[PDB]
Coordinates of C-alpha atoms and ligand atoms in Angstrom, one line a residue:
Chain A
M15 CA 113.0 78.2 134.6
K16 CA 110.0 76.2 133.1
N17 CA 106.3 76.9 132.1
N18 CA 103.7 74.4 132.9
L19 CA 101.2 75.6 130.3
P20 CA 101.7 74.0 126.7
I21 CA 101.7 76.9 124.4
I22 CA 98.5 76.5 122.0
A23 CA 99.4 77.5 118.4
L24 CA 96.2 79.5 117.2
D25 CA 96.7 78.9 113.4
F26 CA 93.5 79.9 112.2
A27 CA 92.4 82.0 109.2
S28 CA 90.2 84.6 111.6
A29 CA 89.4 85.6 114.9
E30 CA 86.0 83.7 114.4
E31 CA 87.6 80.5 113.8
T32 CA 90.0 81.0 116.7
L33 CA 87.2 82.0 119.2
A34 CA 85.0 78.9 118.2
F35 CA 88.2 76.5 118.9
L36 CA 88.6 78.3 122.2
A37 CA 85.1 78.0 123.4
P38 CA 85.6 74.5 125.4
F39 CA 88.5 76.2 126.9
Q40 CA 86.6 78.9 128.7
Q41 CA 87.3 78.1 132.4
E42 CA 91.0 76.8 131.7
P43 CA 94.1 79.0 132.0
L44 CA 95.7 79.6 128.7
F45 CA 98.9 80.3 127.1
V46 CA 98.2 80.7 123.4
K47 CA 100.3 81.8 120.3
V48 CA 99.2 84.1 117.6
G49 CA 101.4 83.8 114.6
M50 CA 101.6 85.2 111.0
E51 CA 98.2 83.6 110.0
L52 CA 95.9 84.9 112.5
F53 CA 97.8 88.3 112.9
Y54 CA 98.0 89.4 109.3
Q55 CA 94.2 88.8 108.9
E56 CA 93.1 90.7 112.3
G57 CA 95.7 92.7 113.2
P58 CA 96.3 94.0 116.8
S59 CA 92.7 93.8 117.7
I60 CA 93.0 89.7 118.0
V61 CA 96.0 90.3 120.6
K62 CA 93.6 92.5 122.2
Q63 CA 90.8 90.3 122.2
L64 CA 92.7 87.3 123.8
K65 CA 94.3 89.7 126.4
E66 CA 90.9 90.8 127.5
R67 CA 90.0 86.9 128.0
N68 CA 93.1 86.8 130.3
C69 CA 95.4 84.2 128.0
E70 CA 99.2 84.7 128.3
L71 CA 100.2 85.4 124.8
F72 CA 103.2 84.5 122.7
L73 CA 103.2 86.9 119.6
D74 CA 105.3 84.7 117.1
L75 CA 106.1 87.1 114.3
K76 CA 109.7 86.5 113.9
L77 CA 110.9 90.0 113.1
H78 CA 113.8 89.8 110.6
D79 CA 114.8 93.1 109.1
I80 CA 117.4 96.1 109.6
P81 CA 118.2 97.2 113.3
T82 CA 116.3 100.4 113.3
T83 CA 112.9 98.7 111.6
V84 CA 113.1 95.9 114.4
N85 CA 113.5 98.5 117.1
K86 CA 110.7 100.5 115.7
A87 CA 108.3 97.6 115.3
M88 CA 109.1 96.2 118.8
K89 CA 108.1 99.7 120.2
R90 CA 104.7 99.3 118.6
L91 CA 104.5 95.5 119.7
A92 CA 105.5 96.3 123.5
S93 CA 102.5 98.8 123.4
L94 CA 100.2 95.8 122.5
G95 CA 100.9 94.3 125.8
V96 CA 102.2 90.7 125.0
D97 CA 104.0 88.3 127.2
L98 CA 106.4 86.6 124.9
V99 CA 107.6 88.0 121.5
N100 CA 110.5 86.8 119.0
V101 CA 113.3 87.6 116.2
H102 CA 115.4 85.6 114.0
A103 CA 119.2 85.1 115.1
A104 CA 120.0 85.0 111.4
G105 CA 119.4 88.9 111.8
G106 CA 122.6 89.3 113.8
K107 CA 123.5 90.6 117.3
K108 CA 123.0 94.3 116.5
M109 CA 119.5 93.7 115.5
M110 CA 118.8 91.5 118.2
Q111 CA 119.9 94.3 120.7
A112 CA 117.9 96.6 118.8
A113 CA 114.9 94.6 119.3
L114 CA 115.4 94.4 123.1
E115 CA 115.9 98.3 123.3
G116 CA 112.8 98.7 121.3
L117 CA 110.9 96.7 123.6
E118 CA 112.3 98.5 126.6
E119 CA 111.5 102.0 125.2
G120 CA 107.9 101.1 124.1
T121 CA 106.9 99.5 127.2
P122 CA 104.8 102.1 129.7
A123 CA 105.8 102.4 133.3
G124 CA 104.3 100.0 135.8
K125 CA 104.3 96.7 133.5
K126 CA 106.9 94.2 132.7
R127 CA 108.7 94.4 129.2
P128 CA 107.8 91.5 127.0
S129 CA 110.2 88.5 127.1
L130 CA 112.3 88.2 124.1
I131 CA 113.4 85.2 122.5
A132 CA 115.4 84.3 119.3
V133 CA 114.9 81.9 116.5
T134 CA 117.7 79.6 116.1
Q135 CA 117.0 77.2 113.2
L136 CA 113.4 76.7 112.3
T137 CA 111.9 73.3 113.4
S138 CA 111.1 72.5 109.8
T139 CA 114.8 72.9 108.7
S140 CA 116.9 69.6 108.0
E141 CA 120.9 69.8 108.1
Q142 CA 120.7 69.1 104.4
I143 CA 118.7 72.2 103.7
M144 CA 120.7 74.2 106.0
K145 CA 123.9 73.5 104.3
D146 CA 122.8 73.4 100.7
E147 CA 120.1 76.2 100.6
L148 CA 121.3 78.5 103.3
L149 CA 125.1 77.8 103.0
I150 CA 126.0 77.4 106.6
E151 CA 128.9 74.8 106.6
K152 CA 128.8 74.2 110.5
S153 CA 126.7 71.5 111.7
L154 CA 122.8 72.2 112.6
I155 CA 123.3 71.7 116.4
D156 CA 126.3 73.7 116.6
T157 CA 124.7 76.6 114.5
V158 CA 121.9 76.3 117.0
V159 CA 124.4 76.6 120.0
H160 CA 126.2 79.6 118.4
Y161 CA 123.0 81.4 117.7
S162 CA 121.7 80.8 121.1
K163 CA 125.1 82.3 122.4
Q164 CA 124.8 85.5 120.3
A165 CA 121.2 85.7 121.7
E166 CA 122.4 85.3 125.0
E167 CA 125.4 88.0 124.6
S168 CA 122.7 90.7 122.9
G169 CA 120.7 90.4 126.3
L170 CA 117.7 88.0 125.3
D171 CA 115.8 85.8 127.5
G172 CA 116.0 82.8 125.3
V173 CA 115.4 81.0 122.0
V174 CA 113.2 79.1 119.9
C175 CA 114.8 75.8 119.0
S176 CA 114.0 71.9 118.9
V177 CA 113.8 69.5 121.8
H178 CA 116.9 67.7 120.6
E179 CA 119.2 71.1 120.7
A180 CA 117.9 71.9 124.3
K181 CA 120.7 69.8 126.1
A182 CA 123.7 71.2 123.9
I183 CA 122.1 74.6 124.2
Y184 CA 122.7 74.4 128.1
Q185 CA 126.2 73.5 127.8
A186 CA 126.9 77.1 126.4
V187 CA 124.4 79.4 128.1
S188 CA 122.9 79.9 131.7
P189 CA 120.2 77.7 133.3
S190 CA 117.5 80.3 133.5
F191 CA 117.8 80.8 129.6
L192 CA 114.4 79.9 127.9
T193 CA 114.2 76.9 125.3
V194 CA 110.8 77.5 123.8
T195 CA 110.3 74.3 121.6
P196 CA 108.0 73.7 118.5
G197 CA 107.9 70.5 116.5
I198 CA 105.8 68.6 119.1
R199 CA 103.8 66.0 118.3
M200 CA 101.8 62.8 120.0
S201 CA 103.1 59.3 119.2
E202 CA 100.5 58.5 116.8
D203 CA 100.7 61.8 115.2
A204 CA 101.9 63.1 111.7
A205 CA 105.1 65.0 111.5
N206 CA 104.1 67.3 108.7
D207 CA 106.6 69.7 107.7
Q208 CA 108.3 69.4 111.0
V209 CA 111.7 67.5 110.7
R210 CA 113.1 67.8 114.4
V211 CA 110.2 66.2 116.4
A212 CA 109.3 65.2 120.1
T213 CA 106.5 64.1 122.1
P214 CA 105.7 66.4 125.2
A215 CA 107.2 63.4 127.4
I216 CA 110.6 63.8 125.3
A217 CA 110.5 67.5 125.7
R218 CA 110.4 67.4 129.6
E219 CA 113.0 64.7 129.5
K220 CA 115.7 66.8 127.8
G221 CA 114.8 70.1 129.8
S222 CA 112.7 72.3 127.1
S223 CA 111.6 75.3 129.2
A224 CA 108.2 75.7 127.2
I225 CA 106.6 73.6 124.6
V226 CA 104.5 75.0 121.5
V227 CA 101.7 72.7 120.3
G228 CA 99.7 73.3 117.1
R229 CA 97.9 70.7 115.2
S230 CA 98.2 67.7 117.6
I231 CA 95.6 69.8 119.5
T232 CA 93.9 71.9 116.9
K233 CA 93.5 69.2 114.0
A234 CA 92.4 66.6 116.3
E235 CA 89.2 64.8 116.7
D236 CA 88.7 65.7 120.4
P237 CA 91.1 69.1 121.1
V238 CA 89.8 69.0 124.7
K239 CA 91.1 65.5 124.9
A240 CA 94.5 66.2 123.1
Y241 CA 95.2 69.3 125.3
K242 CA 94.6 67.1 128.4
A243 CA 97.0 64.3 127.1
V244 CA 99.5 66.7 125.9
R245 CA 99.6 68.3 129.4
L246 CA 99.7 65.1 131.4
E247 CA 102.9 63.8 129.4
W248 CA 104.4 67.6 129.9
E249 CA 103.8 67.4 133.6
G250 CA 104.9 63.8 134.4
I251 CA 102.1 61.5 134.9
Chain B
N10 CA 110.0 100.7 88.0
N11 CA 110.0 104.4 87.4
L12 CA 108.7 105.5 90.7
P13 CA 111.0 105.0 93.9
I14 CA 109.5 103.1 96.4
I15 CA 108.8 105.3 99.6
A16 CA 109.3 103.4 103.1
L17 CA 106.6 104.6 105.4
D18 CA 108.4 104.2 108.5
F19 CA 105.8 105.6 110.7
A20 CA 104.2 104.8 114.1
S21 CA 100.6 105.3 113.1
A22 CA 98.1 105.8 110.3
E23 CA 97.7 109.8 111.1
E24 CA 101.7 110.3 110.9
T25 CA 101.5 108.4 107.4
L26 CA 98.6 110.4 106.0
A27 CA 100.1 113.4 107.0
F28 CA 103.2 112.9 105.3
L29 CA 101.5 111.7 102.3
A30 CA 99.4 115.1 102.2
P31 CA 101.7 117.5 100.5
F32 CA 102.0 114.9 97.7
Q33 CA 98.3 115.7 96.7
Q34 CA 97.3 113.3 93.8
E35 CA 100.9 112.6 92.3
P36 CA 101.2 108.7 91.6
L37 CA 103.2 106.9 94.4
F38 CA 104.7 103.6 95.1
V39 CA 104.7 103.0 98.9
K40 CA 106.1 100.4 101.3
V41 CA 104.3 99.3 104.3
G42 CA 106.9 97.7 106.9
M43 CA 106.6 95.9 110.1
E44 CA 106.1 99.2 112.0
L45 CA 103.1 100.5 110.3
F46 CA 101.4 97.0 109.8
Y47 CA 102.0 95.8 113.4
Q48 CA 100.4 99.0 114.6
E49 CA 97.3 99.4 112.5
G50 CA 97.2 96.0 111.0
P51 CA 95.4 95.4 107.3
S52 CA 93.5 98.7 107.8
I53 CA 96.5 100.8 106.5
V54 CA 96.8 98.6 103.5
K55 CA 93.1 99.1 102.6
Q56 CA 93.3 102.9 103.4
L57 CA 96.6 103.5 101.2
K58 CA 94.8 101.5 98.3
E59 CA 92.1 103.9 98.1
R60 CA 94.2 106.5 97.4
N61 CA 95.5 104.8 94.4
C62 CA 99.1 103.9 95.6
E63 CA 101.2 101.1 94.2
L64 CA 101.9 98.9 97.5
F65 CA 104.8 96.8 98.6
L66 CA 104.1 94.9 101.9
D67 CA 107.6 94.5 103.2
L68 CA 106.8 92.0 106.0
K69 CA 109.8 89.4 105.3
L70 CA 107.9 86.2 106.2
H71 CA 110.6 83.8 107.5
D72 CA 108.6 80.6 109.1
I73 CA 107.9 76.9 108.5
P74 CA 106.2 76.3 105.3
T75 CA 102.6 75.7 106.2
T76 CA 102.5 78.9 108.2
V77 CA 104.1 81.2 105.3
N78 CA 101.5 79.3 102.9
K79 CA 98.5 80.2 105.1
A80 CA 99.9 83.5 105.9
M81 CA 100.4 84.5 102.2
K82 CA 96.7 83.5 101.5
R83 CA 95.8 86.3 104.0
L84 CA 97.9 88.8 102.6
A85 CA 96.7 88.2 99.1
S86 CA 93.2 89.4 100.0
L87 CA 94.6 92.9 100.7
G88 CA 95.3 93.3 97.0
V89 CA 98.9 94.5 97.1
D90 CA 101.4 94.6 94.3
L91 CA 104.5 93.5 95.8
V92 CA 105.1 91.2 98.7
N93 CA 108.2 89.2 100.3
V94 CA 109.8 86.1 102.3
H95 CA 113.4 85.5 103.5
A96 CA 115.4 83.3 101.2
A97 CA 117.1 81.8 104.3
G98 CA 114.0 80.1 104.9
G99 CA 114.7 77.7 102.0
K100 CA 113.3 76.6 98.8
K101 CA 110.0 74.6 100.2
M102 CA 109.2 77.5 102.0
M103 CA 109.6 80.0 99.3
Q104 CA 107.5 77.5 96.9
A105 CA 104.7 77.2 99.8
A106 CA 104.6 81.2 99.8
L107 CA 104.1 81.3 95.9
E108 CA 101.5 78.7 96.3
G109 CA 99.7 80.5 99.2
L110 CA 99.7 83.7 97.3
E111 CA 98.3 82.5 94.1
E112 CA 95.7 80.5 96.0
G113 CA 94.7 83.4 98.1
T114 CA 94.5 86.0 95.3
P115 CA 90.8 86.5 93.8
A116 CA 90.1 85.4 90.0
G117 CA 90.4 88.6 87.8
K118 CA 92.9 90.2 90.2
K119 CA 96.5 90.5 89.4
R120 CA 98.8 87.8 91.7
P121 CA 101.1 90.2 93.8
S122 CA 104.8 90.0 92.7
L123 CA 106.9 87.8 95.3
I124 CA 110.3 88.7 95.9
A125 CA 112.9 87.0 98.4
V126 CA 115.4 88.6 100.7
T127 CA 119.0 87.6 100.3
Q128 CA 121.2 89.5 102.8
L129 CA 119.8 92.5 104.4
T130 CA 121.6 95.8 103.0
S131 CA 122.5 96.4 106.7
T132 CA 124.6 93.0 106.9
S133 CA 128.1 93.2 106.3
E134 CA 130.6 90.3 105.4
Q135 CA 132.1 90.0 108.7
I136 CA 128.7 89.9 110.5
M137 CA 127.8 87.4 107.9
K138 CA 130.8 85.5 108.7
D139 CA 131.1 85.6 112.6
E140 CA 127.2 85.9 113.4
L141 CA 125.2 84.1 110.8
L142 CA 128.1 81.2 110.0
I143 CA 128.0 81.4 106.1
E144 CA 131.7 80.9 105.3
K145 CA 131.1 81.8 101.6
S146 CA 131.3 85.7 100.4
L147 CA 128.2 87.9 100.8
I148 CA 128.2 88.3 97.0
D149 CA 128.2 84.4 96.5
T150 CA 125.8 84.0 99.0
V151 CA 123.4 86.5 97.7
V152 CA 123.7 85.2 94.2
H153 CA 123.0 81.6 95.6
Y154 CA 120.0 82.6 97.4
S155 CA 118.8 84.4 94.1
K156 CA 119.1 81.2 92.4
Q157 CA 117.2 79.3 95.2
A158 CA 114.3 82.1 94.7
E159 CA 114.4 81.5 90.9
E160 CA 114.2 77.8 91.0
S161 CA 111.1 78.1 93.5
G162 CA 109.3 80.4 90.9
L163 CA 109.7 83.8 92.5
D164 CA 109.7 87.0 90.6
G165 CA 112.9 88.8 92.2
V166 CA 115.0 89.4 95.2
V167 CA 115.8 92.1 97.5
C168 CA 119.4 92.8 97.5
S169 CA 121.8 95.8 97.7
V170 CA 123.0 97.7 94.7
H171 CA 126.4 96.1 94.7
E172 CA 125.1 92.5 94.1
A173 CA 122.8 93.3 91.0
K174 CA 125.5 92.8 88.4
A175 CA 126.5 89.4 89.9
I176 CA 122.8 88.5 90.2
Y177 CA 122.0 89.3 86.6
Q178 CA 125.0 86.8 85.5
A179 CA 123.4 83.9 87.0
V180 CA 119.6 84.7 86.7
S181 CA 117.1 85.7 83.7
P182 CA 117.0 89.1 82.8
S183 CA 113.3 89.6 83.6
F184 CA 114.2 88.8 87.2
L185 CA 113.5 91.7 89.7
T186 CA 116.3 93.5 92.1
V187 CA 114.7 95.5 94.5
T188 CA 117.2 97.6 96.3
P189 CA 117.2 99.5 99.7
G190 CA 120.3 101.0 101.3
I191 CA 119.7 104.0 99.3
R192 CA 121.1 107.4 100.3
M193 CA 122.0 110.8 98.6
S194 CA 125.6 111.9 98.4
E195 CA 125.7 114.0 101.9
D196 CA 123.3 111.6 103.8
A197 CA 124.1 109.6 106.9
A198 CA 124.3 105.9 106.4
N199 CA 122.4 104.7 109.9
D200 CA 122.4 101.1 110.0
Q201 CA 123.0 100.5 106.3
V202 CA 126.1 99.1 105.2
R203 CA 126.1 98.3 101.5
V204 CA 125.0 102.0 100.5
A205 CA 124.3 103.5 97.0
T206 CA 122.9 106.7 95.5
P207 CA 119.7 106.7 93.3
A208 CA 122.0 107.4 90.3
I209 CA 124.4 104.4 90.7
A210 CA 121.4 102.1 91.3
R211 CA 120.3 103.2 88.2
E212 CA 123.8 102.5 86.4
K213 CA 124.1 99.0 88.3
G214 CA 120.7 97.5 87.0
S215 CA 118.3 97.9 89.9
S216 CA 114.7 97.1 89.1
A217 CA 113.5 99.3 92.0
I218 CA 114.7 101.5 94.6
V219 CA 113.7 101.6 98.1
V220 CA 114.2 104.9 99.9
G221 CA 113.3 105.6 103.5
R222 CA 115.1 108.3 105.5
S223 CA 116.6 110.3 102.8
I224 CA 113.0 111.4 101.9
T225 CA 111.0 111.0 105.4
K226 CA 113.9 112.8 107.5
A227 CA 114.4 115.5 105.1
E228 CA 113.0 119.3 105.6
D229 CA 110.7 119.2 102.7
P230 CA 110.1 115.5 101.8
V231 CA 108.3 116.3 98.5
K232 CA 111.4 118.1 97.1
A233 CA 113.6 115.3 98.5
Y234 CA 111.6 112.8 96.6
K235 CA 111.6 114.9 93.5
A236 CA 115.6 115.0 93.8
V237 CA 115.6 111.0 94.3
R238 CA 113.1 110.6 91.5
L239 CA 115.1 112.7 88.9
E240 CA 118.4 110.9 89.8
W241 CA 116.8 108.0 89.5
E242 CA 115.1 108.3 86.0
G243 CA 117.8 110.4 84.5
Ligands
U5P25 O1 111.1 76.8 114.8 C1 109.8 77.2 114.7 C2 109.2 78.2 115.3 C3 108.0 78.6 115.2 N1 107.1 77.5 114.9 C4 105.8 77.7 115.0 O2 105.0 77.0 115.8 C5 103.7 76.3 115.3 C6 104.0 74.8 115.3 O3 102.9 74.2 114.5 P1 102.7 72.7 114.7 O4 103.7 72.1 113.7 O5 102.8 72.4 116.1 O6 101.0 72.2 114.1 C7 103.7 77.2 114.2 O7 102.6 78.3 114.4 C8 104.9 77.6 113.7 O8 104.9 78.7 113.0 C9 107.7 76.1 114.4 O9 107.0 75.2 114.0 N2 109.0 76.2 114.4
U5P26 O1 118.0 94.5 102.9 C1 116.9 95.2 103.3 C2 115.4 95.1 102.8 C3 114.9 95.8 103.5 N1 115.0 97.3 103.9 C4 113.9 98.1 104.1 O2 113.8 99.3 103.6 C5 113.8 100.5 104.3 C6 114.9 101.1 104.0 O3 115.1 102.4 105.1 P1 116.1 103.5 105.0 O4 117.4 103.0 105.3 O5 116.0 104.0 103.3 O6 115.6 104.8 105.8 C7 113.3 100.1 105.6 O7 112.0 100.1 106.0 C8 113.8 98.6 105.9 O8 112.9 97.8 106.5 C9 116.4 97.6 104.0 O9 116.6 98.6 104.4 N2 117.4 96.5 103.6

């Protein structure tokens, strides 16, 4: 199970900035991502605005709280009409299950429940930071595999991980399990706070289901040329 | 903090306002979580602040450093009193959150206090070992995450009542311990594991208590809050 459209991370301070950026893409089919920055400024109105513009939407809020709060918060998000939403696998199985139940109960009859994925280890987290600061003694790749397996056992559709863990995840989980991979940059682009990086080309090779691309498109001199170059490499030209 | 933080775990602004109505003009420390905020957005924070409520925005930011920094700048325009991140995000991330918070806060306005979630009050040691893969004890992990938060410049942590004494042995006395997992004597524990009463929270050195269902699911919420308040003060 793979997604053809690169998920564009709309990391802007306002709806206005977002809509200005999206202006040259008016006739293009889009898969966009609304994160904490844009959502905490505008609220549910921005999700509604982008849905009216027929964009496929990933609401990347990474819910990490107690089982009942995540369950109740997912009921609110399922009422919004998003296509993909997420939680942290570091919240445990009971929490990931409650999240799934929340999405199921909050989704009206006639429409499909939003796809739910779990964040394993953030693409900005190195093995050294994971061992010393988080106190996880296992290797990063093993922790990601374990977290992905916990997500599947909980009834989830997939995970957020880096491209370099995708092959190992598929040795433990089902082939239809989603691997949504951020930490994507072009060859001549800066890594920023990302530590486990890959090009759209390397992402296709290692078997990523979907790629989340932000700054490589948004902070480029020509975002239109950048999105075209990202998609060509992702499709195989 | 003399005022127990009420967890406004409601599905809309109207259900929150209707809960808050019998309290009238009494000073309240309230908490807006994921449920209320993801439904109403920034508007609910702006509404509660006009009724002179002390506010805790419990969104528990857990993302990459730059996203948390940028997101904290947006939350700092809302004028809240307390906000949080997950310590499981690392030091670089907690530092970025502090920077975003101090940068986004308008001049003349007080910078919102930033606290870090250690291990959720609903997480047990078995779940922390088998599922999260942390081989160290829950208590030692909470103390380590508290130290990471302090070295990052944060004001405190969210932990359970049972870790407070252990945290204070490693951190500064001015460091905050905001403690949820609060239930009265006969109240059902629900999904909470490391439970305590408002009285035991006072005895173990908690800075503030977050109370939800013991108040919100009671027959008379105002009477329930008073019982929780008097047990917390003395
Ligand atoms: O493990 C993860 C999960 C999510 N994101 C998100 O994906 C986007 C990647 O941004 P950029 O590094 O491509 O510009 C951001 O909105 C960020 O919050 C990551 O970077 N890593
Ligand atoms: O470790 C933590 C951190 C935060 N909360 C929050 O505090 C409130 C406590 O709910 P209740 O168990 O008192 O009803 C909830 O909104 C929840 O999200 C916890 O319960 N545990």
